[PDB]
Amino acid sequence: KRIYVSYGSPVIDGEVDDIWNNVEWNIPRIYSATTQTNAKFKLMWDDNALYVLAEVYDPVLNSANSTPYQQDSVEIFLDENFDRAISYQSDDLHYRVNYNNFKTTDAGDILRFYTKTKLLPDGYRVEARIALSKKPINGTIMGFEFQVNEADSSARRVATINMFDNTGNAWQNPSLFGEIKLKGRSDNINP
Ligand SMILES: OC[C@H]1O[C@@H](O)[C@H](O)[C@@H](O)[C@@H]1O
Ligand SMILES: [Ca+2]
Ligand SMILES: [Ca+2]
Ligand SMILES: [Ca+2]
């Protein structure tokens, strides 16, 4: 399916910009197994960047596991040119940030990836910016997929939560991502 992204430039703090409450939550519904952990996320775009605000309900937080994806984290995947390739292309991006704000990259240049995270009672918040290389304009479509790695007190990932891909191959296969179409940028203060 296709998510529609409104135009806007939020401030990366791990605080909720006023302008975030004007767009909608997205619910990832693909669970690997049954779990307490739930999530919701919002999207925005501006002339330079893609913006993501995520909130995870998760009562037990762990990142003792030295495997990045085996920590309470979230992963974002991007197909910028919208190649819907079978394997990762030169413009394909795959990053991850744990609750502590520790960033790791599976695909693409991590210098593009700017993140802050806040602890909440029984969860955390992630606010990320991704520098765009292509000039985003209304109607632009890209590949996008979102995932929540849920670990337990054993320091191991027990469950995943996915927005688009239920197969578990998002980390291999760009074509498994979903759609984001950008809209809402102007064509054109009085004190
Ligand atoms: O390190 C690559 C990892 O990427 C993640 O997207 C997947 O959930 C893991 O199963 C995979 O091993
Ligand atoms: Ca903010
Ligand atoms: Ca957990
Ligand atoms: Ca691509």
UniProtKB/TrEMBL annotation:
Q: Which domain of life is it from?
A: Bacteria
Cite the binding residues for Ca(2+) 2: 58, 60, 72, 150-151
Q: Which residues bind Ca(2+) 3?
A: 79, 83, 91-92
Positions contributing to Ca(2+) 1 binding? 11, 13, 15, 17, 127
Q: Indicate the transmembrane segments per the record.
A: none
Question: What family is this protein classified in?
Answer: Belongs to the glycosyl hydrolase 10 (cellulase F) family.
Annotated protein name in UniProt? Beta-xylanase
